């Protein structure tokens, strides 16, 4: 013809192509007096035979492979059976004839030389269907053209989609996360298009997934099939949200549109996915990542019916990829590492409990007897611990003063650090009817350690939901900094430090307290210990590159609690500069 | 904090969605006036109950106590049940809907000093819930997608139980009674599930018969006589029930909620209640019940705020409720222990059927050639006979002047007595197009008897009556009473004027004087005192007050 | 007492028969405020078991065979499952109880002797179903009669359809045609009835073909199972319209009717067919004919719910079209005629060699490189050729200046004659993007022949879409006639004739030009080949049917008459050329 650019091209001429001569080869219904006729079909293996019209340059295999590279793979989609139907209601005291015809997507392979198409192979792939209806009287003459098409024709507007044939800081604790990135995900270039129905004005039209076969094709990518295999990811999905069926479904979706009396209507259906990510996060880095696109329940676009004789505007294909047509969603859900054993405290912790550690990382499942602030630590505050909440423990099986296991592997990090040589203790509000997981990290000592739990009825409640770092051995002048994993916005980190010198209760020293990268509100306490009381000294201290200085009593213990208000870096570096 | 010490089994209600598992089976996006229909089918694999035990309350204890009072969910989770929702996106928005399983939340609680000390929980799968939101290309609230704690989308319930440790005037024979449809067991023991249908949306509960099995419920007083198989046969005989453990019959319940009302719809499996009895001399000698799986019951309530007042209620007693309309269809059935002999010629004006020691009882199938009054009797009017009409007979195959067997075992007693030693004859209007069954009783004579049929064009008017022959002349004669407006007659010959007193004891008498023609002499006889000729007379009696199974007739001479 | 006397009769008492006693043996549903209940079933294997009530003269086998001969075959229909449902909506603040019951068609076999029915066998064939509903309160007892029927009864009006038990000129070229005679064809009586639903006022009712099985039963008649066997016809159907499935379908049809609130309604559903004819047409005659009734997607008749029973005799076996009128005539390549190919697109001139036998006919597939009028002929214009268009060709695979085979055997006759001994040439508009078939007939000459194609940018374009007969014959005065296959109304036939005598450009002869049976508009040209050839227009709107007008034409001069058929009264058009002095 006359086109543009030299070489071979794969082209999608669009959906809605009906073929010549074979209009009534499926039959039609006659409906009389106000009755509604519903005609439809079910495309499967057998009825989804495509029609190849090759050329010497472009054989069937070449046509197939190149079309399925860029566009919907119709050899796998002829597996999952899809239905459609049309519904016309005859008027009173007059008859109506409607007949059904398959629609096709018309793909082409073209050779272009000097702005001319020299060769064209065509492939018609079965899509859905089109019903045409007429009202008729006994021996009313009907136009031959109503029954019979002499040339291939698109009932929709045609398309010319071609391609030349070349031939963020995550403040997460270390561990596994399963993230729901949302629903309504389709691939580009209609690789997940179900089909299109032209719905004549006054008629009605549906596109159906009846699950006559109970099989779905999830989409799985992984960075390491050894660590994150599909089976493993499915388990994490089970752990995270309790997904059961992955390659199966009993769940039906249908889309239905009734065209008004005055105007025709068009409806396009897609298979969709719900996008999950499984990540392995370590020290600010995604060490492994899989993507699981779980077969969902579809997307449906309803447009007014476009002139079948419109201007065909040629467009180049998009890059392989996804588009979310559903709303935005991020659900981050930690999951118990299955490489890490779970030990159990069968007693609800009341005022005091001491768990003896045999001496490889592990979780400890436990609950409290009474909602309250608990201090938790190992001996000498080494190693550093982490505490997670099992998600949705509350309001199931209960027994006063005893643990009931809900068997929840979905964990919600509260506070704690992954630094086995840094001294810390935890101060957490624990809820009586929840379960919690303590995570004990890997240690290279074989010395019998012990985790200690203590109910705090005092001022240590001000450190609520915080790990407290123990800062040893400040010198009497100069700089000091302390890099740790930053909490998220509005989460907490605390630091317990003793001012240089001997305690006189009069001699002070000039301390400057600030962060380096992240913004934080700092509240400062002075510890006075008889049997911990915290005196609040300043709690309006914004820390990011602060220069403010406050004189603190020498040889006296203080605790700084910091609220992250701007997460600019994975780490939070804390400066304590002394004068 | 509640009331009363001990252990309790509790139904917290249907409509519980679980935490974390909200979008676990996908959702649809619909754009501009398009309607999305999403649905699922609860079946073996996806219908997993979730036990949350406590030391006092094991899984077994939880199961057994919940299935004692409430639905047996281990038999129900086999039969596949469907539900769907239909939401229509507006024009000026897109719409995202996602589907989630609902559960009934049962609990076992220990109560001490007006306080719950221990709670085990059991989530039994019910149906499903769709949650939808309108959106533009925007941050949606975390809470829309993700539930952190278990929650009821309906209003919750607290249904608990403390955990401890007239005259039937029927002839002797078998009856199959339809006691009606819409029978459910109590406390939702036959509940399918509940759908919340938000206003403007639509909701269905479906029985598609993806499996054909149904689970009928059977009781019997004697599994020897009335076994299940036997009862099924009687059901076949009575009403022609064919499938007992199967059905191809579909039921769906569908509601489209208005814009103004959120609607709630509860579906139950129902039963049709049949009774098979053996009735003898006013008494039910044996009785089975067959609850035939029916096509369900659908309760529509206005949807109550999910944050409503929880009113604690004690369970009802084990049993049934009829939610369908009340019904009694009594249908006699040929005793299958009793052979059926045939008169293959249509009875004309006269016919004599010859019968060959204990001559176990038997039926005789026959028809007449002309609609008319027939006198029927055995030799010397012994034994006493009964005549039944086969129900709906002879609208089918016909052959002029011959019997066609329609194979109808469903019989409708007309008249006759169950005293083989009392002399009587029958006077019945017979219809040319019907079949009738004569029932010949057990006799201890081996003497060759004969049943005689005679068309009566005149006099006999004793229509639809048995006539007792009184040979043996105070005197009393106890018989099975006819029903209100049915007849019983008495023929007596006296030593031979004389003063006769005629009255009944427990339960209108027309009196005739015989000469083969009947002259009408006299037109409440219960405890009558009226009286006033020796030498033959016939009394016809119409029961108007059925107070006793029996009618005793006094004939006192003075 | 009845009139049909002396013999045995098969009788259809109608559909809508419910049986006594067995009304609620399937159950029912209770629905409360506003809810809609839908109950239904699907007739198949076990639940489509008929109830035979025979008599000595009429056993089950006799009853079956004689009803399925005249009426629906229920043994073939009971395999393909048919569904129905009813939908009732309970009002607000009120309960509603509906129960379901099978309906039957009631057939009878009767013996009649001397105006008297002396024997009757009855057969109940399962049809669909009926739902009966009532409003109630939970406490209430409802009347026995609602739940329970003591005698067989038709819920529709009964019927008595009985039968005594014994024991247009087609202007088509020669070749095969497949004609679509249209859709919505049912057989007579109710041989194709699916069933009837009585739909209570305010309720709703559907009849469903869900294709739980795929099989369909096409209906085939043939005049010669040797020539037109079913398999052969199926091929022709494939060739004509590309029908693939004949005995199967995945295509669903359901009918739904909602009865108004005051009046009950009835809907009858039928299986329908689409009627195809395959004919072998030769010289105005259908030498062979098969009929193929392809299973379609049904017919749905909605009538008011009705009565006096009128006895009526069955119709003759046959079809009734309830769908709209349709005639689609589609020629098909005779498969007993091989296809030769011109693999290069024809330019302005091409010569295809076709040597000779004393042959079988054959086709030649070719396309042109440029849209235009082409003159096509064999050497000396013998034999006569025919040209067909392959229908819907060349919208598909394309290659510049080459033929692509689209494998289209569906052909659309343009022009040409069968008479293999009449000299002629073709003048046709050919389109660059179409394929065409030339058909070469059987000849008894062994002469090495050639077909010649020439693009005509001349006056010969006025003969567009016409065969031109050569009359070399006129050797003298007198009468002459020329019978040919008539074109259709508004199609063309042309005649090129040389007037007897030597050309002097003065001496004329008186020629009278007329047709015998068909009316035609005749345009007459004088051919002048000198410098170049022209057509000079001599006479313009001549209506030729039994014409008496005469035109003195130059002797030994060539003329061409183009004729437009306007009234097709005969298959043939006989052309008279009567010459005088
Ligand atoms: C003024 C001063 O002494 N600052 C130093 C601090 C403290 O020694 C330390 O915070 C006490 O716990 O340490 C600093 O550097 C550490 C920082 O990068 C953290 C980040 O988590 O890692 C520490 O090293 C790890 C090491 O990577 C592990 O392998 C483990 O075995 O040893 C330690 C465990 O904590 C860095 O030493 C700091 O900024 O916090 C800077 C000065 O070294
Ligand atoms: C004046 C004159 O000769 N007219 C006669 C014409 C012409 O001879 C002829 O049409 C010129 O081509 O022929 C007429 O009869 C022919 C006509 O019936 C055609 C049918 O279209 O069939 C012819 O015979 C065929 C025969 O059927 C074949 O088997 C084979 O032998 O070829 C011949 C061809 O001639 C008839 O001759 C006519 O009406 O057209 C008779 C005229 O008298």
Automatic annotation (TrEMBL), chain A:
Location of the Hemagglutinin component HA-70 C-terminal domain: 449-579
Pfam families, A to Z: Clenterotox (PF03505), HA70_C (PF17993)
UniProt GO cellular component terms: extracellular region
InterPro entries: Clenterotox (IPR003897), HA70_C (IPR040597)
Domain of life: Bacteria
Name of the protein in question: HA3
Organism: Clostridium botulinum B
């Amino acid at each position: 013809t006359i086109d543009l650019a030299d070489g071979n091209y794969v082209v999608s001429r669009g959906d809605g192509w009906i073929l010549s001569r074979q209009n009534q080869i499926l039959g039609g219904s006659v409906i009389s007096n106000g009755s509604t006729g519903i005609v439809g079909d079910l495309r499967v293996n057998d009825n989804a035979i495509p029609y190849y019209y090759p050329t010497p340059s472009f054989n069937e295999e070449y046509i197939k492979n190149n079309i399925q590279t860029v566009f919907a793979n119709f050899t796998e989609a002829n597996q999952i059976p899809i239905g459609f139907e049309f519904s016309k209601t005859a008027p009173s005291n007059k008859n109506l004839y409607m007949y059904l015809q398959y629609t096709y997507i018309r793909y082409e392979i073209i050779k272009v030389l000097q702005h001319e198409i020299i060769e064209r192979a065509v492939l018609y792939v079965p899509s859905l269907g089109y019903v045409k209806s007429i009202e008729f009287n006994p021996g009313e003459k009907i136009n031959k053209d109503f029954y019979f098409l002499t040339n291939d024709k698109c009932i929709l507007n045609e398309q010319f989609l071609y391609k030349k044939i070349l031939e963020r800081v995550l403040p997460y604790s270390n561990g596994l996360y399963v993230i729901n990135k949302g629903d309504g995900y389709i691939r580009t270039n209609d690789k997940d298009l179900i089909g299109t129905l032209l719905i004549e004005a006054g008629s009605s039209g549906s596109i159906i997934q009846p699950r006559l076969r109970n099989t779905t094709r999830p989409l799985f990518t992984t960075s390491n099939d050894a660590k994150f295999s599909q089976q493993y990811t499915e388990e994490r999905l089970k752990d995270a949200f309790n997904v059961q069926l992955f390659n199966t479904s009993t769940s039906l979706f249908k889309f239905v549109e009734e065209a008004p009396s005055n105007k025709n209507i068009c409806i396009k259906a897609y298979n969709t996915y719900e996008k999950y990510e499984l990540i392995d996060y370590q020290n600010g880095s995604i060490v492994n990542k899989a993507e699981y696109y779980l077969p969902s329940l579809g997307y449906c676009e309803v447009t007014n019916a476009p002139s079948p004789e419109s201007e065909v505007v040629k467009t180049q294909v998009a890059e392989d990829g996804f588009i979310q047509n559903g709303p935005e969603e991020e659900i981050v859900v930690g999951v118990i590492d299955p490489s890490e054993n779970i030990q159990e405290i069968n007693t609800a912790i009341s005022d005091n409990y001491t768990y003896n550690i045999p001496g490889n990382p592990f979780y400890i499942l436990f609950t409290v007897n009474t909602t309250g602030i608990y201090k938790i630590n190992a001996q000498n505050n080494l190693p550093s611990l982490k505490i997670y909440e099992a998600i949705g423990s509350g309001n199931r099986n209960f027994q006063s003063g005893n643990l009931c296991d809900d068997d929840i592997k979905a964990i919600n990090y509260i506070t704690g650090f992954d630094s086995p040589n840094a001294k810390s203790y935890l101060v957490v509000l624990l809820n009586k009817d929840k379960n919690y997981y303590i995570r004990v990290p890997q240690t290279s000592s074989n010395i019998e350690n012990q985790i200690k739990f203590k109910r705090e009825e005092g001022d240590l409640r001000n450190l609520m939901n915080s790990s407290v770092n123990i800062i040893d051995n400040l010198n009497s002048t100069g700089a000091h900094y302390y890099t740790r994993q930053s909490p998220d916005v509005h989460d907490y980190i605390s630091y317990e430090f003793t001012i240089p010198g001997n305690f006189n209760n009069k001699d002070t020293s000039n301390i400057r307290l600030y962060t380096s990268y992240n913004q934080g509100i700092g509240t400062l306490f002075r510890v006075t210990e008889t049997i911990y009381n915290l005196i609040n000294i300043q709690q309006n201290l914004n820390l990011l590159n602060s220069t403010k200085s406050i004189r603190l009593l020498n040889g006296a213990i203080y605790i700084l609690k910091v609220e992250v208000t701007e997460l600019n870096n994975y780490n939070i570096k804390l400066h304590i500069d002394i004068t």
